[PDB]
């Protein structure tokens, strides 16, 4: 099939080069695992395996202990064996094309999961949901692995570079700037999530300018980027690449097969900004456990997987009404009644489900 050769340039992040300056954003739980990330990387963009809740893989085939049908504790929720299998299966598809691992800073056992991801063969670690000031501590035995914090401000870039340099004589290999149209957790206070000051086109120049002090660390723009026109806009503002997730949530290869049923139906009015036990606002779909909370028949809360430090073993889950480990795991397992479902602001524009191959050609041709 004819597609004009791309005029986008390969992107180098630390020692690793991707053919197109595009990341498929990590998506937990079980949304961007081996089929999605492996195919993205095969097509020459960065495939990103989510390392969160890997115990759910293949309906908890790889955990050591199950309690109440949930992976027991962080040891089993972030399953090393499952993570190894996901990366191995991804490599069957993409070979030496680089892969990232996405790890929220908020998770319990963060350092162990970072090391597991390096040991599983990741080229790149991507971390948001916090200010990951000690990320090099856990990566120092794997100096080939590139490290990429997700930030929302020039301030955060400066703090991370200062503190990493002072303490590890290292600075990040790239930064992802995640704007307020992104799916999942926002890097903004709730009251700032619908404020034009923080729209991505305003953030990118400020972060790029701050990056000059440190040698023009590549800035990767994320949140609300839909097509090549939006990619070109971000590159013209000084970004070196983009990270996109909602478009990939709409592909056949997505590992959470429920989304191919749900997304073509998604109406804009059903896109919500909700509280989360992680402690950041989250963009979610008004369906599943969120509807059960409204009805009053949502699952009782009981911290089994101990997924994130901010929740304090159920304290915040009880306040917000749901357990994010249980809810996200249920969605990977196909549970429409009690799953938790995330989306970017653009999720309502997904009409048809296309292949990763077709998507990458659409975004890169010309
Ligand atoms: C369904 C879904 C799940 C997500 N889960 C994560 C996650 O686990 N970790 C993370 O850093 N970002 C997560 N995100 C954010 C994406 O990686 C990405 O940065 C953002 O959605 C990009 O905006 P776009 O969706 O408009 O392209 C998620 C996004 C979506 C849509
Ligand atoms: S109760 Fe809180 S810490 Fe425990 S598994 Fe649920 S969201 Fe995670
Ligand atoms: Cl998130």
Numbering used by the authors: -2 to 363
Question: Would you copy out the relevant sentences from the publication that reported this structure?
Answer:
The bifunctional dehydrogenase/isomerase FabX is an essential UFA biosynthesis enzyme in the widespread human pathogen Helicobacter pylori, a bacterium etiologically related to 95% of gastric cancers. FabX belongs to the nitronate monooxygenase (NMO) flavoprotein family but contains an atypical [4Fe-4S] cluster absent in all other family members characterized to date. We demonstrate that the [4Fe–4S] cluster functions as a temporary electron depot that receives electrons from FMN and sends electrons back to FMN to achieve independent bidirectional internal electron transfer.
